[PDB]
Design a protein around this ligand. Structure first.
Ligand SMILES: NC(=O)C1=CN([C@@H]2O[C@H](COP(=O)(O)OP(=O)(O)OC[C@H]3O[C@@H](n4cnc5c(N)ncnc54)[C@H](OP(=O)(O)O)[C@@H]3O)[C@@H](O)[C@H]2O)C=C[C@H]1[C@H](CC(=O)O)C(=O)C(=O)O
Ligand SMILES: NC(=O)C1=CN([C@@H]2O[C@H](COP(=O)(O)OP(=O)(O)OC[C@H]3O[C@@H](n4cnc5c(N)ncnc54)[C@H](OP(=O)(O)O)[C@@H]3O)[C@@H](O)[C@H]2O)C=CC1
Ligand SMILES: O=C(O)CCC(=O)C(=O)O
Ligand SMILES: [Ca+2]
Ligand SMILES: [Ca+2]
Lengths: 414, 411
């Protein structure tokens, strides 16, 4: 009969597109703002405000995250040919997440939210599997081109200090054309990636695996393997052993077979491409992309960006657009806010904010575990063809049910 | 009065698989099939002795006789170079052979009703066609020791202007860099092989790439497939009510996880290498898989046992200790090659024998006679007792008796 909200501090918010934008606003309206006062720095990364500002709004939000150390980002449209038409864009703008990653740096850690009544697709997975994706280099910064006919492709290195160049033959095309590409990574980026992985394994108490293909790329993938091993021996091995965990290198194909027959419960450090791909595989194996969280941990050990690990759910948004009922899972988006607020509360020693962030995570899981859930989770239980309308809640019924349970939980603890 | 078997190129391998290989031939093959065997030793010592020329000679012999069957082989790491005092950390024979022959490697689980799958919805099989040529498996990678410029250059053979592209200006330290390529003609054969596999199985075909990122490199795989599809295969796909689609690799691994199986999955060399191990494990046992390289000439094939050489079991066999080594992938390398041998020769007896041996293998396991690894797939290893499985020679022996019965019953 006379309450006062939690003062949450400074957070950078990146508004997004299509179905995740709708969810994003329901989360703020029903779960966050009634309990938490925020110093929000909002940036509209919607497809048409980006285009409006020649994508300057993306870069500015990236700089804002550097300044305030905490960002929460909604899924955004990444333009392709179709999208330039649909929004009559000025150009095919770069992915906002590549731009944001490239400015911030670091490792992207992805993890499924587990509810005990939600069957996995992979039978053995009891505990979670946290993939740490090295968010820099390799294919994502590579230079590729078409080879139009017979000829020589070479890759050369010219030292900056003046000494003589070295020239590696890629291929003599003798029979026609094809394609070629060069790609690189940097030692300091690999070192930051190793440290974040060892640190993540130690804070979760779980073992750590790095996957490469160094049997084939002895120099390129060998560099990753060597940097991890030296940093582990010099800096982490005795800590790992003190907690009865361990670090091992694995070939990527051995690693995906090992992961598939494990029980989970390990950190999986992936090079850029493998982490991009394998984390969608892992996400689906747990049940639903809607349940996949993601946090960019920057090398300063202080800045994070939290987001859902899925897209804008265009398919559902099209149905929403023509008045048709939808059942879109908000948990990944919710945990973007709770992870961002948890981190804000850690930097600030804000006890009430940290208790709120965890209460909302608990509430989300408890609601599903009591049998109230969106359709994608119902399908995990029954199999899609066998789901009845009575087995699940639509988008708005589920937020309402969550909002109801969160008011109860928070008024209980006071 | 044996079955006429014809010419077959055999590549001998290493450690436990080398041992099982000899047992397969003496127990299951040679008692029923007379063969003109052309045998190349790809054991790690002989590759070292010949500076790996024997691997090149084997691949050439496959061009000549059209059928190869390859035993698993050691791919040396640094511990192996010490063990054998190798002249260099030789590269996998599979890479050299695939580079010489070109083609597509089709991988598919070997399914036993009593071996549980780990992925719940995979009720039908998933066939991966891995492009066998180029990309990371023919690349050149090096260490960048400090600041400097990495560039990549194309010099046309006809003497016109060369083109140079900045890969990276290293300004803050060193790192690594690599160059890699593929060929139009080899991609086309990749496409043809995939469209033909789909049509022959009556299943739909998906090609995965990452063309959102590698717009030129992966875009070429995409454009080649689409062009060949529209001009040469779309009509026949529609007549069988199947289709072809390009999918982004990320989308596709998720789609496959939640799918029911029953499709052809065309993969670039790297993805096919990685996802075929994921898929074999998902169907229940990483080792229960077929791996058959189908060459562009449409006539030549090389079946291989895809797993490792089982070093721990070999050491135990060296010390004269009981082992329980699964032979099924080596057996199916023999049956797949002989089956294709029988196809080129219109040899109905050889074709019958190859499928019999495959059938005996499945039936024997489904009846409850299996090696320790398979019993552990069923009970869980901590719960496996000695009486739940056969040792290496007992299993081979049960296979041999069941095969002898199947061939007699059939006449
Ligand atoms: N972070 C972002 O800003 C991203 C935005 N995009 C965009 O999103 C739109 C559509 O893309 P899409 O392919 O449709 O993916 P998405 O995940 O939205 O939906 C797929 C299907 O997954 C099921 N599903 C997903 N979520 C839910 C849910 N909550 N509830 C229930 N079912 C769900 C549902 O399944 P169904 O119910 O249909 O069976 C759905 O349809 C495109 O514009 C992309 O640019 C993709 C990912 C990242 C970035 C992009 C980048 O940086 O370039 C990325 O990671 C990458 O690099 O690729
Ligand atoms: N390929 C090459 O193969 C060699 C070793 O590769 P590695 O990665 O060590 O994999 P291995 O082939 O050595 O097998 C690894 C382990 O998995 C199990 N295993 C593998 N194949 C079988 C089988 N056919 N029957 C039963 N159990 C099996 C065994 O587990 P256990 O020992 O627990 O029975 C074995 O110890 C290397 O030189 C590599 O280059
Ligand atoms: O890659 C090798 O060295 C051969 C073993 C292997 O991984 C395979 O054949 O798939
Ligand atoms: Ca991805
Ligand atoms: Ca492999």
């Amino acid at each position: 009969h006379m309450s006062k909200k939690i003062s949450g501090g400074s957070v950078v918010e990146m508004q997004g597109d299509e179905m995740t934008r709708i969810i994003w606003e329901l989360i703020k309206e029903k779960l966050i703002f009634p309990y938490v006062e925020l110093d929000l720095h909002s940036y509209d990364l919607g497809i048409e405000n980006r285009d409006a500002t020649n994508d300057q709004v993306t870069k500015d939000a990236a700089e804002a995250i550097k300044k305030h150390n905490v960002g929460v980002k909604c899924a955004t449209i990444t333009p392709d040919e179709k999208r330039v038409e649909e929004f009559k864009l000025k150009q095919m703008w770069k992915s906002p997440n590549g731009t944001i990653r490239n400015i911030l740096g670091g490792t992207v850690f992805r993890e499924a939210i587990i509810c005990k009544n939600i069957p996995r697709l992979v039978s053995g997975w009891v505990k979670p599997i946290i993939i740490g994706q090295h968010a820099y280099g390799d294919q994502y910064r590579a230079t590729d081109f078409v080879v139009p006919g017979p000829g020589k492709v070479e890759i050369t290195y010219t030292p900056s200090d003046g000494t003589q160049k070295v020239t590696y033959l890629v291929h003599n095309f003798e029979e026609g054309g094809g394609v070629a590409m060069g790609m690189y990574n940097q030692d300091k980026s690999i070192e930051d990636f190793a440290h974040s992985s060892f640190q993540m394994a130690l804070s979760k108490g779980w073992p750590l695996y790095l996957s490469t293909k160094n049997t084939i790329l002895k120099k390129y993938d060998g560099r990753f393997k060597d940097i991890f091993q030296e940093i582990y021996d010099k800096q982490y091995k005795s800590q790992f052993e003190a907690q009865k965990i361990w670090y091992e290198h694995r070939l990527i194909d051995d690693m995906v077979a090992q992961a598939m027959k494990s029980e989970g419960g390990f950190i999986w450090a992936c090079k850029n491409y493998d982490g991009d791909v394998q984390s969608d595989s892992v996400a689906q194996g747990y049940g639903s992309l809607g349940m996949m969280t993601s946090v960019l941990v920057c090398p300063d050990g202080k800045t994070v960006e939290a987001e859902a690990a899925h897209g804008t759910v265009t398919r559902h948004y099209r149905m929403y657009q023509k008045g048709q009922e939808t059942s879109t899972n908000p948990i990944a988006s919710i945990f973007a806010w709770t992870r961002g607020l948890a981190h804000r509360a850690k930097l600030d020693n804000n006890k009430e904010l940290a208790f709120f962030a965890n209460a909302l995570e608990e509430v989300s899981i408890e609601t599903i575990e009591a049998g109230f859930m969106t359709k994608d989770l119902a399908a995990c239980i029954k199999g899609l063809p066998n789901v009845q309308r009575s087995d699940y809640l639509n988008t708005f019924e589920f937020m309402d049910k969550l909002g109801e349970n969160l008011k109860i939980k928070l008024a209980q603890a006071k």
